[PDB]
Amino acid sequence: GSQEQGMGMDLYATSPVAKEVWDRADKHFRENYGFSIIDIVKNNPKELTVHFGGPRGKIIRQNYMSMTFETVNADG
Amino acid sequence: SDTLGGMARRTLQSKYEAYDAATSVQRQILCYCKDAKEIYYDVEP
């Protein structure tokens, strides 16, 4: 609820510590889910799309595919 | 934002009015954003 655009980005620039945190995070997200949370935070997109391109791209949609979700029937 | 801050301030008014005044408890509510410098112990001479 308190998420404001560009939050804690000022601190990003001024702290070599906080910097590396966001980095390791982004590094992850980009290479695994194919987007950057830093971008999403800096400039808030009303829309954003990922792309399952070459070698490194096929491995991403793999994760999107390997997303499991549980709901049982009314008969068990 | 200071969401939990004005939340913990409000629990100090509705319940803790007498407890703090009696016990002599000093209370200091600091949000990251607003109360920035008092966290990092940065003051000028």
Side-chain angles (χ1 to χ4, degrees):
Chain A
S2 42
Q3 57 275 342
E4 298 182 12
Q5 161 158 185
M7 81 195 84
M9 283 310 168
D10 41 9
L11 176 255
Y12 179 119
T14 48
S15 171
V17 195
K19 213 271 194 177
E20 87 95 26
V21 167
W22 283 89
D23 286 351
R24 287 209 295 125
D26 217 47
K27 171 82 170 176
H28 203 257
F29 278 108
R30 300 197 325 266
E31 299 179 351
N32 292 300
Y33 307 129
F35 58 82
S36 157
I37 58 168
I38 317 191
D39 276 1
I40 296 177
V41 167
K42 265 185 178 166
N43 28 32
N44 186 8
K46 282 193 292 178
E47 148 184 327
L48 145 65
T49 131
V50 321
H51 298 270
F52 320 117
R56 296 173 168 183
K58 319 283 182 44
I59 87 183
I60 304 274
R61 62 171 172 173
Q62 202 44 68
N63 295 54
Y64 278 82
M65 283 162 48
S66 297
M67 295 287 260
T68 311
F69 174 34
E70 213 90 307
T71 286
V72 170
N73 208 344
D75 48 64
Chain B
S1 289
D2 73 322
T3 48
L4 283 180
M7 191 152 299
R9 278 161 211 148
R10 274 199 163 192
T11 33
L12 283 194
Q13 302 159 359
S14 75
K15 270 194 196 170
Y16 288 56
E17 184 39 44
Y19 188 102
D20 284 22
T23 313
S24 179
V25 182
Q26 311 176 17
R27 292 195 193 280
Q28 188 187 355
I29 288 180
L30 307 188
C31 171
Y32 194 98
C33 331
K34 306 193 172 185
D35 313 288
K37 297 198 174 182
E38 315 180 32
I39 302 290
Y40 282 39
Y41 284 112
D42 180 30
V43 201
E44 254 69 14

